[PDB]
Design a protein around this motif. Sequence first.
Motif, PDB file in Angstrom:
ATOM      1  N   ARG A  13       7.678   5.550   9.361  1.00  0.00           N
ATOM      2  CA  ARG A  13       6.804   5.215  10.479  1.00  0.00           C
ATOM      3  C   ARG A  13       6.344   3.764  10.329  1.00  0.00           C
ATOM      4  O   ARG A  13       6.301   3.012  11.305  1.00  0.00           O
ATOM      5  CB  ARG A  13       5.596   6.152  10.500  1.00  0.00           C
ATOM      6  N   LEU A  14       6.007   3.382   9.098  1.00  0.00           N
ATOM      7  CA  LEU A  14       5.562   2.026   8.791  1.00  0.00           C
ATOM      8  C   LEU A  14       6.666   1.022   9.094  1.00  0.00           C
ATOM      9  O   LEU A  14       6.424  -0.028   9.687  1.00  0.00           O
ATOM     10  CB  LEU A  14       5.197   1.907   7.308  1.00  0.00           C
ATOM     11  N   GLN A  15       7.882   1.347   8.667  1.00  0.00           N
ATOM     12  CA  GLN A  15       9.020   0.468   8.880  1.00  0.00           C
ATOM     13  C   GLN A  15       9.312   0.283  10.367  1.00  0.00           C
ATOM     14  O   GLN A  15       9.932  -0.702  10.769  1.00  0.00           O
ATOM     15  CB  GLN A  15      10.249   1.023   8.152  1.00  0.00           C
ATOM     16  N   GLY A  16       8.850   1.228  11.181  1.00  0.00           N
ATOM     17  CA  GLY A  16       9.072   1.134  12.615  1.00  0.00           C
ATOM     18  C   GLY A  16       7.975   0.361  13.327  1.00  0.00           C
ATOM     19  O   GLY A  16       8.069   0.099  14.527  1.00  0.00           O
ATOM     20  N   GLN A  17       6.933  -0.006  12.585  1.00  0.00           N
ATOM     21  CA  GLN A  17       5.802  -0.748  13.138  1.00  0.00           C
ATOM     22  C   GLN A  17       5.934  -2.248  12.901  1.00  0.00           C
ATOM     23  O   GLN A  17       6.692  -2.687  12.037  1.00  0.00           O
ATOM     24  CB  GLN A  17       4.493  -0.267  12.508  1.00  0.00           C
ATOM     25  N   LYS A  18       5.178  -3.029  13.667  1.00  0.00           N
ATOM     26  CA  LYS A  18       5.213  -4.478  13.539  1.00  0.00           C
ATOM     27  C   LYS A  18       4.658  -4.904  12.184  1.00  0.00           C
ATOM     28  O   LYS A  18       4.953  -5.992  11.693  1.00  0.00           O
ATOM     29  CB  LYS A  18       4.399  -5.130  14.663  1.00  0.00           C
ATOM     30  N   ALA A  19       3.854  -4.038  11.577  1.00  0.00           N
ATOM     31  CA  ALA A  19       3.263  -4.337  10.282  1.00  0.00           C
ATOM     32  C   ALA A  19       4.265  -4.180   9.138  1.00  0.00           C
ATOM     33  O   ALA A  19       3.934  -4.445   7.983  1.00  0.00           O
ATOM     34  CB  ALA A  19       2.055  -3.432  10.039  1.00  0.00           C
ATOM     35  N   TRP A  20       5.487  -3.763   9.455  1.00  0.00           N
ATOM     36  CA  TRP A  20       6.500  -3.566   8.417  1.00  0.00           C
ATOM     37  C   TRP A  20       6.762  -4.813   7.582  1.00  0.00           C
ATOM     38  O   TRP A  20       6.760  -4.747   6.354  1.00  0.00           O
ATOM     39  CB  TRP A  20       7.823  -3.080   9.024  1.00  0.00           C
ATOM     40  N   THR A  21       6.990  -5.948   8.239  1.00  0.00           N
ATOM     41  CA  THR A  21       7.266  -7.188   7.516  1.00  0.00           C
ATOM     42  C   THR A  21       6.245  -7.438   6.416  1.00  0.00           C
ATOM     43  O   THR A  21       6.607  -7.762   5.282  1.00  0.00           O
ATOM     44  CB  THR A  21       7.290  -8.402   8.468  1.00  0.00           C
ATOM     45  N   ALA A  22       4.970  -7.281   6.750  1.00  0.00           N
ATOM     46  CA  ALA A  22       3.896  -7.479   5.788  1.00  0.00           C
ATOM     47  C   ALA A  22       3.888  -6.362   4.741  1.00  0.00           C
ATOM     48  O   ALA A  22       3.625  -6.608   3.565  1.00  0.00           O
ATOM     49  CB  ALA A  22       2.549  -7.527   6.511  1.00  0.00           C
ATOM     50  N   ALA A  23       4.168  -5.137   5.177  1.00  0.00           N
ATOM     51  CA  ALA A  23       4.188  -3.997   4.267  1.00  0.00           C
ATOM     52  C   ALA A  23       5.311  -4.158   3.246  1.00  0.00           C
ATOM     53  O   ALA A  23       5.093  -4.002   2.043  1.00  0.00           O
ATOM     54  CB  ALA A  23       4.370  -2.700   5.051  1.00  0.00           C
ATOM     55  N   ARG A  24       6.512  -4.469   3.729  1.00  0.00           N
ATOM     56  CA  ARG A  24       7.653  -4.651   2.840  1.00  0.00           C
ATOM     57  C   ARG A  24       7.364  -5.773   1.854  1.00  0.00           C
ATOM     58  O   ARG A  24       7.694  -5.671   0.677  1.00  0.00           O
ATOM     59  CB  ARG A  24       8.924  -4.992   3.628  1.00  0.00           C
ATOM     60  N   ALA A  25       6.748  -6.848   2.339  1.00  0.00           N
ATOM     61  CA  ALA A  25       6.423  -7.979   1.482  1.00  0.00           C
ATOM     62  C   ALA A  25       5.505  -7.538   0.347  1.00  0.00           C
ATOM     63  O   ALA A  25       5.695  -7.937  -0.805  1.00  0.00           O
ATOM     64  CB  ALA A  25       5.756  -9.087   2.300  1.00  0.00           C
ATOM     65  N   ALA A  26       4.515  -6.707   0.669  1.00  0.00           N
ATOM     66  CA  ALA A  26       3.581  -6.227  -0.343  1.00  0.00           C
ATOM     67  C   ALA A  26       4.265  -5.250  -1.296  1.00  0.00           C
ATOM     68  O   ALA A  26       4.092  -5.341  -2.512  1.00  0.00           O
ATOM     69  CB  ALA A  26       2.383  -5.559   0.318  1.00  0.00           C
ATOM     70  N   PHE A  27       5.033  -4.316  -0.742  1.00  0.00           N
ATOM     71  CA  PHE A  27       5.732  -3.340  -1.570  1.00  0.00           C
ATOM     72  C   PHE A  27       6.748  -4.025  -2.480  1.00  0.00           C
ATOM     73  O   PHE A  27       6.842  -3.713  -3.670  1.00  0.00           O
ATOM     74  CB  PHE A  27       6.464  -2.301  -0.709  1.00  0.00           C
ATOM     75  N   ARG A  28       7.512  -4.958  -1.920  1.00  0.00           N
ATOM     76  CA  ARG A  28       8.526  -5.654  -2.703  1.00  0.00           C
ATOM     77  C   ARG A  28       7.894  -6.455  -3.834  1.00  0.00           C
ATOM     78  O   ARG A  28       8.354  -6.404  -4.973  1.00  0.00           O
ATOM     79  CB  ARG A  28       9.356  -6.576  -1.800  1.00  0.00           C
ATOM     80  N   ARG A  29       6.831  -7.186  -3.524  1.00  0.00           N
ATOM     81  CA  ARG A  29       6.157  -7.981  -4.534  1.00  0.00           C
ATOM     82  C   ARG A  29       5.499  -7.105  -5.604  1.00  0.00           C
ATOM     83  O   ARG A  29       5.385  -7.517  -6.759  1.00  0.00           O
ATOM     84  CB  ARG A  29       5.116  -8.891  -3.877  1.00  0.00           C
ATOM     85  N   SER A  30       5.091  -5.891  -5.234  1.00  0.00           N
ATOM     86  CA  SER A  30       4.444  -4.990  -6.189  1.00  0.00           C
ATOM     87  C   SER A  30       5.344  -4.600  -7.363  1.00  0.00           C
ATOM     88  O   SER A  30       4.859  -4.088  -8.371  1.00  0.00           O
ATOM     89  CB  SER A  30       3.957  -3.712  -5.499  1.00  0.00           C
ATOM     90  N   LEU A  31       6.647  -4.826  -7.237  1.00  0.00           N
ATOM     91  CA  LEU A  31       7.561  -4.482  -8.324  1.00  0.00           C
ATOM     92  C   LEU A  31       7.322  -5.336  -9.561  1.00  0.00           C
ATOM     93  O   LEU A  31       7.749  -4.982 -10.661  1.00  0.00           O
ATOM     94  CB  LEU A  31       9.019  -4.612  -7.873  1.00  0.00           C
ATOM     95  N   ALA A  32       6.626  -6.455  -9.385  1.00  0.00           N
ATOM     96  CA  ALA A  32       6.333  -7.350 -10.500  1.00  0.00           C
ATOM     97  C   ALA A  32       5.137  -6.858 -11.312  1.00  0.00           C
ATOM     98  O   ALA A  32       4.853  -7.383 -12.392  1.00  0.00           O
ATOM     99  CB  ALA A  32       6.059  -8.763  -9.976  1.00  0.00           C
ATOM    100  N   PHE A  33       4.440  -5.852 -10.793  1.00  0.00           N
ATOM    101  CA  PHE A  33       3.258  -5.312 -11.463  1.00  0.00           C
ATOM    102  C   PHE A  33       3.338  -3.802 -11.659  1.00  0.00           C
ATOM    103  O   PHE A  33       4.157  -3.123 -11.039  1.00  0.00           O
ATOM    104  CB  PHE A  33       1.998  -5.618 -10.642  1.00  0.00           C
ATOM    105  N   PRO A  34       2.473  -3.254 -12.526  1.00  0.00           N
ATOM    106  CA  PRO A  34       2.499  -1.807 -12.747  1.00  0.00           C
ATOM    107  C   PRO A  34       2.180  -1.118 -11.421  1.00  0.00           C
ATOM    108  O   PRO A  34       1.390  -1.629 -10.622  1.00  0.00           O
ATOM    109  CB  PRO A  34       1.394  -1.593 -13.780  1.00  0.00           C
ATOM    110  N   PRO A  35       2.800   0.042 -11.163  1.00  0.00           N
ATOM    111  CA  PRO A  35       2.562   0.782  -9.922  1.00  0.00           C
ATOM    112  C   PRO A  35       1.075   1.048  -9.718  1.00  0.00           C
ATOM    113  O   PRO A  35       0.384   1.473 -10.642  1.00  0.00           O
ATOM    114  CB  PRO A  35       3.345   2.077 -10.138  1.00  0.00           C
TER     115      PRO A  35
END
Length: 156
Positions: A13-35
């Motif tokens: 649902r998130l990926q289908g929203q306009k907020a996806w770009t920002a969400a993916r950016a946050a999720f992707r960057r989170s891989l550099a830190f502990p979950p």
Amino acid sequence: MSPGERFLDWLKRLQGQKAWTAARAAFRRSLAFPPGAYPRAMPYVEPFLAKGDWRQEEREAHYLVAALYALKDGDHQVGRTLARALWEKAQGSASVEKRFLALLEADRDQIAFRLRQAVALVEGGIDFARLLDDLLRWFSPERHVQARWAREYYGA
């Protein structure tokens, strides 16, 4: 639905929203830190976790899956479990099997790192719903999830 299927719906649902770009950016960057330790990813996961009652380890499982989902650009392939995807990858690289076994043997301090490495290693999409359901039960004394992964890998 299972916890994994419910979260997958949320991510889709998130990926289908306009907020996806920002969400993916946050999720992707989170891989550099502990979950669960990356502030910017929280606004995209907490609203979901709020709908249920979770232990910290379980919240972290959701954060890690969201991060891995983003890494694969949301390419969810129902039925293609990480274990099966690893077997396919191992046909071209025997050493992949040792990584798979180390993954099954990972404890609380190694699982996040090894899971990120395993997902980054395989080609194509995987079943993120089953991935979360499995991670949520990863610390069972029985290690039933680990045994099933072995079944899926050697069964492929």
